[PDB]
Every structure is written in structure tokens, then in C-alpha cells.
Design a protein around this ligand. Structure first.
Ligand SMILES: Nc1ccn([C@@H]2O[C@H](CO)[C@@H](O)[C@H]2O)c(=O)n1
Ligand SMILES: [Mg+2]
Length: 102
């Protein structure tokens, strides 16, 4: 059973603890949708660590990301924009995946 999605492993504990309940992705991962049950691995080694259920999705842009998105990523807003600037350089169109770890 392969993984459907990965996260940087520095987020693993936040996810398992329920501190991170959304993830902000680009068009490459815009196909995930409410009701999806997804196997989740670490980006660095593809090691499975949980199965999530997608509970909501929405679109967002760089200039419409909010303090609340940051809070749900378990980050400050400044920290979130910094991460996006590195992961998705030059990009402005994003996709919010809200989820719970099963
Ligand atoms: N909000 C985000 C966006 C991305 N990522 C990780 O970065 C990889 C490449 O985008 C993704 O495959 C994922 O591992 C993340 O952990 N959190
Ligand atoms: Mg940086």
C-alpha cells in the first residue's frame, strides 16, 4: 500500500498530535477532495505514518492566506509564507486540504 501524499517529517508529530489540520499545496495536489482517505508518508523516506481523511478543501492565493491558515498549519503567518516561498518558489495559486488523522 503506497502513500498518496507526503509531508516533511518535521511535521509528523504535529500531524499525529492534531496540531496541524490543514496543508497548503499547489496544483499538483489539487485532485484530493473531501471524503478521500489517504495514506501519508514522510517526504524524506516515504515511510508511512498515518492515514488521513480529507474533511474540506478550498482554493487560496498567496495574498489571501490568513492567520487562521497559519494556525491550522501550526505556524505563524510569517513562517507559513517563508515555507511557501521555498517549497513553491514564484507561485501564487494554492489549494487547501483540511484533514484529520484516523
Ligand atoms: N504545506 C506543505 C507543502 C508541501 N509539503 C511537502 O513538500 C513536498 C513538496 O511540495 C510535499 O510532497 C510535502 O512532502 C509539506 O510538508 N507541507
Ligand atoms: Mg526559507
Amino acid at each position: 500500500q503506497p502513500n498518496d501524499i507526503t509531508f516533511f517529517q518535521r511535521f509528523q508529530d504535529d500531524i499525529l498530535a492534531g496540531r496541524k489540520t490543514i496543508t497548503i499545496r499547489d496544483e499538483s495536489e489539487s485532485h484530493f477532495k473531501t471524503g478521500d482517505v489517504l495514506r501519508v508518508g514522510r517526504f524524506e523516506d516515504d515511510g508511512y505514518f498515518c492515514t488521513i481523511e480529507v474533511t474540506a478543501t478550498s482554493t487560496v492565493t498567496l495574498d489571501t492566506l490568513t492567520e487562521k491558515h497559519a494556525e491550522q498549519e501550526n505556524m505563524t503567518l510569517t513562517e507559513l509564507i517563508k515555507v511557501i516561498a521555498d517549497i513553491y518558489p514564484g507561485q501564487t495559486q494554492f489549494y487547501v486540504i483540511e484533514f484529520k488523522c484516523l
